[PDB]
Every structure is written in C-alpha cells, then in structure tokens.
C-alpha cells in the first residue's frame, strides 16, 4: 500500500520477443531497448524527450485515487 512508486512518469518501450536459449533454457532477447525505463517528472517532459528522439508515444493520463470520505463512527449506525 506504498504510494512512493506511483509519483514519477516513466517512458518504457514496447515488449518484443523474449525466447529460450536452447542450451540452458535461459530467456534470450534481441531487443536492445528492452530494459529501458527512462523516468521523468511530468507529462510535458516525457513527450518532449520522445519527440526529441523520434519515438512514437502513447501518453496515459495519471490515475490518482479520488478522495473517499472515511469515518470511524459510521459503522456503528444501525
């Protein structure tokens, strides 16, 4: 329930083939940009970097929980 990993905007790339090394059964890959997760601080600064480097983007708006009113006594009503 920690919300410290949902505060900075990330720019991750598409998921390409993750296959199996015939000899040992490990997962192998040919996507050089697979482990790439650039971390920005605002939508504006991420769109800028992607446009800067010539990649295509799919911005997804933030989803902060709305405020839900909580009261202790409420569960004692009848």
């Amino acid at each position: 329930s920690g919300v410290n990993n949902t505060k900075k905007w990330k720019m991750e790339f598409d998921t390409r083939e993750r296959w199996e090394n015939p000899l040992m059964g490990w997962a192998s890959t040919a996507d050089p940009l697979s482990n790439m997760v650039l971390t920005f601080s605002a939508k504006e600064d991420a769109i800028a970097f992607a446009e800067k480097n010539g990649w295509s983007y799919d911005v997804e708006e933030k989803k902060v929980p709305k405020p839900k009113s909580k009261s202790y006594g409420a569960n004692f009503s009848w």
Partner: peptide, 12 residues
C-alpha cells in the same frame, strides 16, 4: 499504516 485500507472501514 496497517489495518487501514481506503475502501475498507477504519478499525484502529
């Protein structure tokens, strides 16, 4: 916090 979840009643 433990025992407090946003969509669950406060228990303390």
């Amino acid at each position: 916090r433990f025992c407090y979840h946003e969509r669950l009643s406060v228990a303390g």
